[PDB]
Design a binder for this molecule. Sequence first.
Ligand SMILES: NCc1ccc(C(=O)O)cc1
Length: 239
Amino acid sequence: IIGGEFTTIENQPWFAAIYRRHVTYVCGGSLISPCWVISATHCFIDYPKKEDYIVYLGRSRLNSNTQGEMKFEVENLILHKDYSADAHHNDIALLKIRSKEGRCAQPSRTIQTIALPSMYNDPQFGTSCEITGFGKEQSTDYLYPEQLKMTVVKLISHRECQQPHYYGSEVTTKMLCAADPQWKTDSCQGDSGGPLVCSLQGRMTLTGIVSWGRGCALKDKPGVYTRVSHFLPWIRSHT
Ligand SMILES: NCc1ccc(C(=O)O)cc1
């Protein structure tokens, strides 16, 4: 996350930190139900083996065990069959979580689920949503922040993101663009699979999943996100 502010897991009780054994940080995710964390397929396409991943819930730091956190193995890693990169397409994945004691996640003050959107129901452009992650704080940074971060970004119309000086055609209607009016804050390397949460009808909804973007916080190059209300049939069936 470029710019923005620091936060703890209580301000995003649904944020999941995903890691890979041969143990490093992989991507963020979102808990949509006790046994399912939703994320981005490009995060796992290179190491499809569910056995190498570890998922945490209620964790606010990248390399320190946050009090009250739950650790989970991936009982199942489901990647979207129609995925394709180069501007990732259908960048969505589902991870079924299960602890060593074979249990899923149990809600607490630091672990809650996030609601999915109603079909094809997205806030109007210009709406302010938030993004969470352990991503880089600066494009030239080598390290990832140790503390979780979040920032605000405004939804951009498909017509506006469609423009050439923007992302041209790389962006599809199954995608949502979001960015800062001054391009001073945005998601970056390490924030993928993370949630784009917007308030829809007075309800916090998982509107988008960090997917891709040209660099970070650069003019006319918004962050692109997998449009969740366009993959509900895929989510319900697969869960
Ligand atoms: N602004 C979206 C975005 C998400 C992820 C990356 C990246 O992993 O390198 C870059 C940009």
